Amino acid sequence: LNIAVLLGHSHDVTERELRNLWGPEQATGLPLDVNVVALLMNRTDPKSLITHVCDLMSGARIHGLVFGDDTDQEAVAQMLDFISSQTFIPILGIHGGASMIMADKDPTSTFFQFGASIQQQATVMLKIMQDYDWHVFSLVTTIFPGYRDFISFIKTTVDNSFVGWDMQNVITLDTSFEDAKTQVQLKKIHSSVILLYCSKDEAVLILSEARSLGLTGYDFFWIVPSLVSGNTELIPKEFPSGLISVSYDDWDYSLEARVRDGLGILTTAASSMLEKFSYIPEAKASCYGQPLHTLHQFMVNVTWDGKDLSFTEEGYQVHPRLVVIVLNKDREWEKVGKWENQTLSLRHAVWPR
Amino acid sequence: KIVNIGAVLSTRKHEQMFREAVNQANKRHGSWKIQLNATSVTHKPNAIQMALSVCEDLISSQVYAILVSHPPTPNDHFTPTPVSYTAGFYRIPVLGLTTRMSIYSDKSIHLSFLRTVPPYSHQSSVWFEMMRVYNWNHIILLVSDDHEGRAAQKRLETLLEERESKAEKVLQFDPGTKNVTALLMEARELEARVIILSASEDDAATVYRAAAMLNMTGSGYVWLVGEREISGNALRYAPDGIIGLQLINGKNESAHISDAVGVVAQAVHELLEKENITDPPRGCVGNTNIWKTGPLFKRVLMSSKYADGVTGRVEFNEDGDRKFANYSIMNLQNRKLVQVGIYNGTHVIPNDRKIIWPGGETEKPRGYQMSTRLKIVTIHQEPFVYVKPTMSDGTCKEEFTVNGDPVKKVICTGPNDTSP
Numbered sequence: 051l052n053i054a055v056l057l058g059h060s061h062d063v064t065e066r067e068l069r070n071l072w073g074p075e076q077a078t079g080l081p082l083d084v085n086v087v088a089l090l091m092n093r094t095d096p097k098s099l100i101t102h103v104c105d106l107m108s109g110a111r112i113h114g115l116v117f118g119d120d121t122d123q124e125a126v127a128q129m130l131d132f133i134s135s136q137t138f139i140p141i142l143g144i145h146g147g148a149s150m151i152m153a154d155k156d157p158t159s160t161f162f163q164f165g166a167s168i169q170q171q172a173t174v175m176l177k178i179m180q181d182y183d184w185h186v187f188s189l190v191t192t193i194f195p196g197y198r199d200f201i202s203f204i205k206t207t208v209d210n211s212f213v214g215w216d217m218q219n220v221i222t223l224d225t226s227f228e229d230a231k232t233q234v235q236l237k238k239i240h241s242s243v244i245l246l247y248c249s250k251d252e253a254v255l256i257l258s259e260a261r262s263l264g265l266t267g268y269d270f271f272w273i274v275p276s277l278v279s280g281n282t283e284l285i286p287k288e289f290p291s292g293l294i295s296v297s298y299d300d301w302d303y304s305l306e307a308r309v310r311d312g313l314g315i316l317t318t319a320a321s322s323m324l325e326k327f328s329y330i331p332e333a334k335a336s337c338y339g340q341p342l343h344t345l346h347q348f349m350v351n352v353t354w355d356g357k358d359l360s361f362t363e364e365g366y367q368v369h370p371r372l373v374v375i376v377l378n379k380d381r382e383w384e385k386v387g388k389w390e391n392q393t394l395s396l397r398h399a400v401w402p403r
Numbered sequence: 404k405i406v407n408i409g410a411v412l413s414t415r416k417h418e419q420m421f422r423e424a425v426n427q428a429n430k431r432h433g434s435w436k437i438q439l440n441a442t443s444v445t446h447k448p449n450a451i452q453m454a455l456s457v458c459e460d461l462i463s464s465q466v467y468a469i470l471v472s473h474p475p476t477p478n479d480h481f482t483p484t485p486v487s488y489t490a491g492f493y494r495i496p497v498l499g500l501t502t503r504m505s506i507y508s509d510k511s512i513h514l515s516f517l518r519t520v521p522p523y524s525h526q527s528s529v530w531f532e533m534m535r536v537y538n539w540n541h542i543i544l545l546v547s548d549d550h551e552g553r554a555a556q557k558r559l560e561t562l563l564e565e566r567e568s569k570a571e572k573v574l575q576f577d578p579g580t581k582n583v584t585a586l587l588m589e590a591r592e593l594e595a596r597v598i599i600l601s602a603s604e605d606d607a608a609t610v611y612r613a614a615a616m617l618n619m620t621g622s623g624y625v626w627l628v629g630e631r632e633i634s635g636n637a638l639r640y641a642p643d644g645i646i647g648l649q650l651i652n653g654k655n656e657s658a659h660i661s662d663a664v665g666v667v668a669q670a671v672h673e674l675l676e677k678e679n680i681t682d683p684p685r686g687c688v689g690n691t692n693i694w695k696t697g698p699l700f701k702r703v704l705m706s707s708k709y710a711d712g713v714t715g716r717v718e719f720n721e722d723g724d725r726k727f728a729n730y731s732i733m734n735l736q737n738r739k740l741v742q743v744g745i746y747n748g749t750h751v752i753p754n755d756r757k758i759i760w761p762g763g764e765t766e767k768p769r770g771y772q773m774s775t776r777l778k779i780v781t782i783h784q785e786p787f788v789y790v791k792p793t794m795s796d797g798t799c800k801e802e803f804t805v806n807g808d809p810v811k812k813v814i815c816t817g818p819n820d821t822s823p
């Protein structure tokens with residue numbers, strides 16, 4: 051189908067390869083109205099988003115939008131959810147803020163993301179902690195939302211642990227730093243891994259408070275998810291040596307492969323829907339003067355280029371590619387760990403301290 | 404240096420009231436030298452062109468807060484979602500004034516969609532307080548939806564944990580179908596007749612049609628519904644004597660808009676009392692700077708105490724709702740809304756009218772049958788429960804004891820052995 055691809059300036063990805071991706075590829079094109087519109091926008095803003103919606107959906111009925119975000123917010127993808135709630139156009143979250151992991155989606159929305167959820171990411175992080183023999187840990191969680199499922203998964207893992215994980219009690223931060231009552235909570239932490247689930251600036255303040263009080267030793271590790279750390283371009287101040295982040299922002303990984311897999315899944319869905327129902331374009335025509343067949347529960351059994359690109363029941367990939375990066379003394383983030391289909395792969399066997 | 408107020412508002416009398424409230428918001432709210440101008444949008448059939456006009460009014464004008472005040476939406480979507488998501492891109496909360504769904508109460512999808520109206524969990528709390536008046540324990544729950552249904556079931560389990568009791572039977576099915584008669588027939592044979600419904604308008608009309616085809620409007624049936632079940636065809640298909648709820652100063656649009664502008668303007672001036680005054684950026688070329696005073700504005704708004712208002716004392720809780728909501732317990736006596744009670748936040752006061760139910764008298768509906776059908780379970784104890792096979796077919800031989808007492812056998816259902 052007609053699918054428009056828009057990008058920004060993430061990972062030095064240009065726009066001419068989006069034009070070259072249509073010519074020699076798409077050989078088994080069962081729809082006839084398969085065209086691409088490659089676009090770039092300098093700023094991230096909803097004004098240009100709704101402008102390209104009202105300018106491309108009226109542009110010969112484009113039923114596909116690819117967006118590349120470089121912010122630190124998953125609600126940008128929620129903007130695409132408004133395309134999934136009115137026009138009911140299936141949008142694949144590719145990379146950046148349009149594919150970050152949030153808590154609970156809706157079954158009525160036809161929107162999808164690429165990546166593993168917070169439960170599978172916690173499973174990967176606990177597999178890392180089990181392979182490195184770091185049993186005694188901590189858990190410091192703020193009042194940032196999406197905290198019940200993560201703490202509940204840690205509690206159900208420790209209560210059903212085959213290893214015997216020594217779980218320290220939950221350190222809660224209802225207010226900001228005062229250095230009157232939170233200092234007692236910081237002095238009780240004598241574990242190895244200090245878990246953290248909060249925003250970006252709150253993480254900067256907590257790591258600055260830990261650096262100012264000497265809680266950033268070699269024994270005191272800091273393992274953060276993609277929501278706490280964020281993108282790999284912006285690196286703020288007061289980060290301790292020994293910060294292990296779990297994300298997907300990889301510099302040498304191809305965004306062209308991401309958009310090629312997205313176009314392959316969407317054209318496979320369109321070719322499988324063409325054999326069932328005739329009128330494939332059935333959506334909102336234009337933004338001037340106002341569902342029966344959607345592709346939400348139809349392209350679950352998709353497979354492109356031999357890879358397991360199937361969809362889950364929550365709107366995610368079944369086996370994505372996880373990235374585990376570390377922070378060295380050179381103020382850089384280097385990729386260390388990657389995730390396999392079933393098990394977990396570890397490149398560096400000897401772990402540096 | 405200019406400040407424009409985002410207001411999705413088109414009715415001209417409310418435009419004059421909005422301009423008067425903007426003029427009054429800078430009079431006694433301090434000697435600060437800021438000015439406030441109005442920016443309104445017109446009617447469009449869709450919601451994407453509405454969102455385009457709104458975001459063109461927002462990003463190119465450096466706005467502070469947004470007010471959406473159209474409860475008669477032209478479409479059947481009823482979504483204040485695109486303006487709230489547009490401002491939530493810049494971490495800006497939107498105080499919506501129309502919707503009351505529990506999908507807007509979740510802080511995962513809607514990160515900062517605040518509101519001055521309570522959700523349906525407060526109506527479930529009012530139903531639970533009406534359970535405390537007539538001592539209602541066993542209830543039947545029927546919920547069609549699944550987004551608000553999980554929050555309603557969680558709030559009902561929280562209230563029953565506050566009572567330290569248990570529910571009888573809950574039902575959650577798929578809307579759109581019409582085979583809901585068998586579920587109501589299975590709910591007929593329960594231990595009580597209290598019916599609680601939490602659904603949309605079409606699902607309420609469907610279950611009212613199924614209750615009319617099964618004659619569930621007899622004696623003892625408790626009819627206690629809310630707002631969505633007394634609107635549209637669900638108002639038409641409801642039996643005479645059904646109990647609903649009505650908002651006090653909620654349907655009055657002008658006073659609600661004036662109170663909302665007062666609360667938002669007091670929040671803006673309270674944010675201007677302190678330092679770190681930032682503005683939302685533009686969207687033209689090459690500057691992707693994010694808004695840094697998100698948690699500061701959240702600490703200002705979510706911990707705000709108010710005392711002014713035409714509707715009442717408004718106060719934001721931890722979820723951004725309305726405290727001490729005045730309700731009207733209404734009765735539908737012969738297709739006419741009859742005022743039979745009013746509701747402060749702590750006590751229910753009925754008026755001098757009669758609460759007429761579709762069952763018996765003006766008292767509570769006697770729908771208790773948890774003693775007329777008792778599943779007496781027992782274990783095969785040797786001196787206590789003698790179990791004996793029948794003679795020919797289901798008969799009991801009247802044995803004779805030594806004291807003239809005839810053996811009064813009961814027809815029980817006995818198995819031979821266990822599963823192995």
Ligand SMILES: *[C@@H]1O[C@H](CO)[C@@H](O)[C@H](O)[C@H]1NC(C)=O
Nearest residue numbers: 059089090091092093688689
């Ligand atoms: C800005 O966007 C235009 C396309 O609209 C693109 O040609 C240009 O390279 C971009 N400039 C930068 C570096 O932001």
Ligand SMILES: *[C@@H]1O[C@H](CO)[C@@H](O)[C@H](O)[C@H]1NC(C)=O
Nearest residue numbers: 322326347348349350351352
């Ligand atoms: C995939 O699933 C759909 C139902 O969603 C089914 O109709 C179809 O036969 C299945 N096979 C493929 C790979 O299309």
Ligand SMILES: *[C@@H]1O[C@H](CO)[C@@H](O)[C@H](O)[C@H]1NC(C)=O
Nearest residue numbers: 356357358369389390391392
């Ligand atoms: C995962 O499985 C696919 C086949 O479904 C295979 O092509 C791919 O190489 C596997 N990747 C690994 C080893 O993680």
Ligand SMILES: *[C@@H]1O[C@H](CO)[C@@H](O)[C@H](O)[C@H]1NC(C)=O
Nearest residue numbers: 404405406407437438439440
């Ligand atoms: C409001 O509009 C008037 C007329 O355009 C303008 O002179 C005034 O500066 C504006 N007020 C502010 C500061 O927003």
Ligand SMILES: *[C@@H]1O[C@H](CO)[C@@H](O)[C@H](O)[C@H]1NC(C)=O
Nearest residue numbers: 578579580581582583584585
């Ligand atoms: C309801 O049940 C009947 C069978 O009794 C079935 O034919 C029908 O499709 C179902 N759907 C409706 C009308 O609710």
Ligand SMILES: *[C@@H]1O[C@H](CO)[C@@H](O)[C@H](O)[C@H]1NC(C)=O
Nearest residue numbers: 613614615616617618619620
């Ligand atoms: C229900 O009530 C009507 C009117 O009294 C009666 O005719 C009918 O037999 C009853 N039975 C049904 C259909 O539930």
Ligand SMILES: *[C@@H]1O[C@H](CO)[C@@H](O)[C@H](O)[C@H]1NC(C)=O
Nearest residue numbers: 649650651652653654655656
């Ligand atoms: C306000 O609302 C009530 C219903 O709650 C209505 O009877 C009354 O006419 C309304 N008054 C105004 C000012 O519109």
Ligand SMILES: *[C@@H]1O[C@H](CO)[C@@H](O)[C@H](O)[C@H]1NC(C)=O
Nearest residue numbers: 251677678679680695696699
């Ligand atoms: C204003 O912001 C700065 C930097 O975040 C902070 O240090 C300061 O405490 C803030 N001012 C107040 C009074 O909160």
Ligand SMILES: *[C@@H]1O[C@H](CO)[C@@H](O)[C@H](O)[C@H]1NC(C)=O
Nearest residue numbers: 715716726727728729747748
């Ligand atoms: C309800 O209305 C009464 C006046 O009848 C008013 O005093 C009260 O403030 C309102 N509700 C609240 C906020 O308790």
Ligand SMILES: *[C@@H]1O[C@H](CO)[C@@H](O)[C@H](O)[C@H]1NC(C)=O
Nearest residue numbers: 745746747748750751752753
């Ligand atoms: C609610 O409380 C106010 C006093 O705060 C009182 O004036 C009013 O009559 C009460 N409303 C009811 C429920 O009668």
Ligand SMILES: *[C@@H]1O[C@H](CO)[C@@H](O)[C@H](O)[C@H]1NC(C)=O
Nearest residue numbers: 791792817818819820821823
């Ligand atoms: C019950 O089970 C036994 C075997 O355990 C069998 O011999 C007998 O015929 C069965 N009938 C009775 C007495 O219920």
